[PDB]
Every structure is written in structure tokens, then in C-alpha cells.
Amino acid sequence: AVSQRNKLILWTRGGGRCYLCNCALLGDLISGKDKLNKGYIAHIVAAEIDGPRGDPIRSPLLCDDVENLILLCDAHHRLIDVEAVAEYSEPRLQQIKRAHEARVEAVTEITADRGTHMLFYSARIGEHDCPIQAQDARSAVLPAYYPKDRHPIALDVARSEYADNEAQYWQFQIENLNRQFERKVRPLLADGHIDHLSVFGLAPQPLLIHLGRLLSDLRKVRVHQLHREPKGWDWRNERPPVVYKTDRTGHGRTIALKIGISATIVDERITRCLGEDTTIWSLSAEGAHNDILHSEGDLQTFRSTCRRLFDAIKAAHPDATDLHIFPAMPVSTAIELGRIWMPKADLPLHIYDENRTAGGFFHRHSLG
Amino acid sequence: AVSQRNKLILWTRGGGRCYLCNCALLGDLISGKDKLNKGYIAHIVAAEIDGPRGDPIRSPLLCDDVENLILLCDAHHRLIDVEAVAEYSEPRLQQIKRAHEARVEAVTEITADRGTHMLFYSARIGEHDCPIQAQDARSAVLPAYYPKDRHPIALDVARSEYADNEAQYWQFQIENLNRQFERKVRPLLADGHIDHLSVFGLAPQPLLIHLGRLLSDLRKVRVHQLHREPKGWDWRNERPPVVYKTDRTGHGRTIALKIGISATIVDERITRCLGEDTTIWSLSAEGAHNDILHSEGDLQTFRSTCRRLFDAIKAAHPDATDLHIFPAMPVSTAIELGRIWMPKADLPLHIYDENRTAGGFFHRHSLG
Ligand SMILES: [Mg+2]
Ligand SMILES: [Mg+2]
Ligand SMILES: [Zn+2]
Ligand SMILES: [Zn+2]
């Protein structure tokens, strides 16, 4: 008889399907319908010397050799053993066997990769009080991804002797994010060992938008959000979906977009900063607060909503100079704004940041 | 211990692959490398009451139940039993089991006659930032087809020191598309090595139409579209069908057709570069935007609409020598335009391209 191990090997290699018609044999095996041929195993060289394609030497030599076995439903076992023996010689059955098993392996191999690389963008990476820590990141990617390497790729929000309201800070942080990406990320992407990137960013919104721009050409990226109670970076999905809705005020030719997702922004702060002659488009979340981005669906609906608004804005204003962005966005949406921006389909973006020391909005960074 | 029959069932349903990374386990099973966990079987609810997700009632109830078993390599068995027990809850592991076994069955169902060759037309084929990659293509042909060869056939939008706004560039790309097609595709067709062809094109629309013309006589072709959110080349089916509208303006001697599916094209832009003595036919999609081609039905309905429009244009202008095409089309529709054009009955096509930064439409290619 055929060993249980050879049965397992052949059924795995054969995908549990008839090698001539591909029909599914597992359900019948479980049902015990394999009374004529246990396990639906067919011998190419018959185990019996007097059988179809039998041989006095090779029949006993091959009766428990998996390289001599195929799976057949009862009908097609009868076809190669009784009705059409001459049609199905050892080489022809052997070639159907290789081809069936090669095909099965190739299709079960095709699937998205689960392994991911963590990318951190934050101040104080590697220090005791860093708000993104490797053990919290490695847990947060499960179970949708698993860490392919234990250690994150570290992009530093580098320590600086300039404050958020001095231009000096923004030039230093932008060029330093640029050097950093071009130094530790690009060579690993070029090299091809990274197939999925899990992103954990905590930085001023203009820098997070630039990070998103740097990630825009990548195919496998999952952005994470810092959640607030309990603190952590794992996606949750426990609340009703965030409701976003778009609007506009004014009719000047300076096009602005305020994005009030974690907070509200009144139109005054934009007109006080831009001209009085403005059009202020709006992307708002109902109940805007800094813990509003709860679930990945919330992030996807932001991406698609923001995409629709970007199209609508350029369609409504075919005389484009730029678009002036005024954000109050969770870190995950700020990265995704930069990631979905299309360098030559969208308007160029001028990103404003609230000077929290004294005074309102100031232009700190641009895309395009 | 787990029965030999349940081991066979699980190994067949699982395709002999780790349910967390999809790596192949049979070779290691045959080699006796399954020293820590025999057969690479992991219990979701542990067989041991004291184990991960163990239970005094359900552990013995399920220790020989195939619905509680998965296949795992040693590293991911340790991931769900030691490192990340809480993250990998029974419901989350059950999802993975159901998804893994559903995919394995659906892909092994694809019969041997459904094999396909991937054909790429794009810049930067084989580089990390190419927007068409072998792994996304081979996933995209499933479950309708399976890749007959692991490697795509690469037609390059070849690098040159020419710019798209000078004629030499277009002449260069056309001879290179012709040469590569004649040597990498055609010689394999005659014998039957290449039969069904799955096509992934990302190129300037006039070159994509030419690609379609090169495919025009082929009987087995499936064109793919590059989608956004999520990125990928797999056909989707989540939206209402695209709505197409055919219309016409003017009564002039020179016949034009604008095809605004991913964007709108106003009549000016046709009027001169061509003149005022024009008839401007139109084939537009309601809500034209760059991700509008969602489903394979949307592409088929484009084919039939464009076919009907071509006939109507020929009937309406029996003294017309040719037709001036002004496209703003998804990549898949552009290929299919070239593929359905009939030299026998249709007007010759002069294809125009939007000159970036200079501005305006310029004649870059012709068919017939
Ligand atoms: Mg037999
Ligand atoms: Mg276990
Ligand atoms: Zn059969
Ligand atoms: Zn694994």
C-alpha cells in the first residue's frame, strides 16, 4: 500500500484535484466515496505487474514512489486504465503530472507579502521618552502585517536651536528630512528587499506632508495614527465612522483650502493671512478633535474625500497659480495629504503653520 | 495527537504553505525539519489548556478538529504562541485560516488551459519605482488566468536624449515598440509558445494606441488598467458602470474626435490647432476623472461605444479622408482604441498629444 506520508505529499502537490479535469477530490475523500481507489491515487506504472503500463522490475520498484503517482477522479482513472491505455503512456502521464504540480505551486505562491518594514519619523528616536517606540510599532502592524525586520528605519526630527516660528527651523528640517530619506530609505528601496512600509510619523504637519510626498511613488505603504486613550499606534475601529464634508466660501482668485479635522479653523485666520480677495474651500470633520482619526476606514475616506476635493478645486478654478493649505490634521492624514498629491495633476501646495507664540498662519513649506 | 487524515486535509487546504508568510513547507516536511512542531501544525485554540488561547473546555474539544488547525513555519508559530499571543486572537487567526484556504482553493481551480503571458509597456521596467511590477501583474491575472511564465515580456518606453515635444522622440519610441514587439512577442506566437496575452501599458497615449494596433489581430488579449486607491492593476467591481456619451458639434470639412474619459476637453483646444472649419465629434464619460475606469465591463462598454461612434463618423462623412483624435483616456481605453480600429472600414487616425508646458495639442502619430 501507499504510505500515508506519500499520500500527504501527493495530495499537497496535486492540490487535491484530478490531474486530468482538475475537479476537487477533497470533499469526496472526506465523504469516504473513494471505495474503488483509496485516496484517488492512480499509479502511472501500475503497482501490479500485469496492470496498465506494468513492468516486472519497475512495478514493485515504483508502487510506493510518489514520482509515479497522480490524483484522478474515478472516471478518469478508468479512462487511463481501461478505455484509453494506449493514449496515456508513461511519458504522457508523467508530463501531465509535472505540469499539473508545477501549475499548482505557481498559483499558490502568488499573494501579497505580509512582511513589513517599519519607518519612524519623529524627534528623539531611540530615547526613553520617544513617542514612537519599536515594541509598540512591532505590535501595531499585526495582524495585517508582521515585522520583516525587528528594527525600524529611523528618520530623525533632528534637534535644533531654532523654534517653530523661525524660517531657519523649516529649512533645516526639510533639507534634513530630504538628506535622511535619500540616505537610509532610497538605497534600501532600490535594493528591493523592502516590499511593504509601515509608517509611524510624529512631526509638525508641514514636515509630515513632505514625508508623504517622499512616499508618494511607493506601492505598499500603510500609515499609522497615534491614538490617544489608550495611547498607541495600532488601528482600532470601535467608533462610528468619521463624517467629513466639503464646502466653500468667498469668490476671490486666491484659492485656499482649510482642513479642519482635529480642530476648527475660522475663515478669519485665512483672510487675515491671505488677501481679502480669496476663495476658501473647506475639508472638515464633524466633531473635529485631535483623537478623531480612529480607524483605517476613517483614513481611507479622508484619502478619497481629499481626492474628490482636489479634482473639484482645479475644475472650478482652471486659472491655477497654487492652492494655499491651512491644516489642523491628525498625523496620519497629514502624511496622506502629501502621499495622494499628484505632482503634475494637482495645484502646487503652499503649506501654512500656526505660529503658536504670537501671530497666526505663516507659509512654511511648499510642494510643486 | 492529530489524526493522519486531518493532517492530509489541512495540508491540502493550506497548499503546504505557512498561513502567515506563505512560504512552502513540504520540502522541510520531507527533510524532517519539523522538529519543534510535527507537520508544522499550529492549534489556534491550543491543545494544551495552559497554552496560548487554551481553554479547559474547548482545548480537548478542538485538539483534533481541522477547523482549529493552521500550517505555520517555526518562526511564525513562535510569533503567534510566544511573541504576539494577544494580537493574534482566535477570531483573527480564524480570519487568516479562512482567507488562506479560500485563496488556495480558488487559484488551484484555474485549469491548465487558462495560462497567460504578461506583457508590459512602460518606462523603467525592472526598477524599484516602476509602476508596473511582475508581482502585481501576476496577482492581477488571477483568478481568470494564471501566469504561464514567471517573467513579464518587457516593451520599453525607451530612454533617449529626445524630448516628447520634438518629432524625433515619437519616431524613436515607435521604432522601438515595433522592434521589441516583433522580436519578443511575434516569434513566440507562430509556434504557440505565447497564446493568451495579459497587457499592462503605461505610456503616452499615442504610443498606447500603437501598442493596441500591434495587438489588433490577436484573438486572446486581456488589457489591464492601473487603478488608484489602492494602487494596482487588478480589475475591480465596486462602482456603478461608467456612463458614456456620444455627441457632435459643427459642420466643417475637417473631422475631429475628442475622447474625454479621464478629463474634459473643451472645443477651443481642437479649434485651432485645427481651424474653425471643423466637425468635432466627442466621446465623453460623465464625471471624467483619472480613476474612472474601474471595471472590465467599463472597458468593454468603451469598446462597443467607440466602435459604434467610429461607424457613425464614417457614415456621416463619406468624403472624409481622415479623423483627428484628441484623447484624454485611461491607459486601458487607449490600448483598446488601437485594438478595435479597422483598416478595412475605419478612417485613418491622426493622434494628437498635449504638449506639456508649451501648451496646445500637436500631431504626434497616425494609424493607416
Ligand atoms: Mg491504475
Ligand atoms: Mg501551538
Ligand atoms: Zn477527472
Ligand atoms: Zn511563515
Author numbering:
A (entry chain A), B (entry chain B): 4 to 371
The authors write:
Here, we present the biochemical and structural characterization of two CBASS systems, composed of CdnG and Cap5, from Asticcacaulis sp. and Lactococcus lactis. We show that CdnG from Asticcacaulis sp. synthesizes 3′,2′-cGAMP in vitro, and 3′,2′-cGAMP is the biological signaling molecule that activates Cap5 for DNA degradation. Each monomer of Cap5 is composed of the N-terminal HNH domain, the C-terminal SAVED domain, and a short flexible linker connecting these two domains. The structures revealed that both Cap5 form homodimers, resulting from the side-by-side packing of two HNH domains.
On the other hand, two SAVED domains in the structure of AsCap5 are close and make contact with one another. But the two contacting surfaces are not completely closed and a gap between them can be seen. Therefore, the structure of AsCap5 can be best described as in ajar configuration. Importantly, unlike the two-fold symmetry applicable for the entire LlCap5 structure, the Front of the first SAVED domain of AsCap5 faces the Back of the second SAVED domain. Therefore, the two-fold symmetry is only applicable to the HNH homodimer. The HNH domain of AsCap5 (AsCap5-HNH) is significantly more structured near the active site than the one of LlCap5. Specifically, a well-coordinated Mg2+ ion is only observed with AsCap5-HNH, and nine residues of LlCap5-HNH near the active site are disordered. We created a model of AsCap5-HNH in complex with DNA•RNA hybrid, which revealed that part of a loop in AsCap5-HNH has a steric clash with the DNA strand of the modeled DNA•RNA hybrid (colored black). Based on this analysis, we conclude that the configuration of AsCap5 shown in Fig. 3b is also likely to be inactive. 3′,2′-cGAMP might act as a glue, bringing two SAVED domains closer to seal the gap shown in the structure of AsCap5 (right).
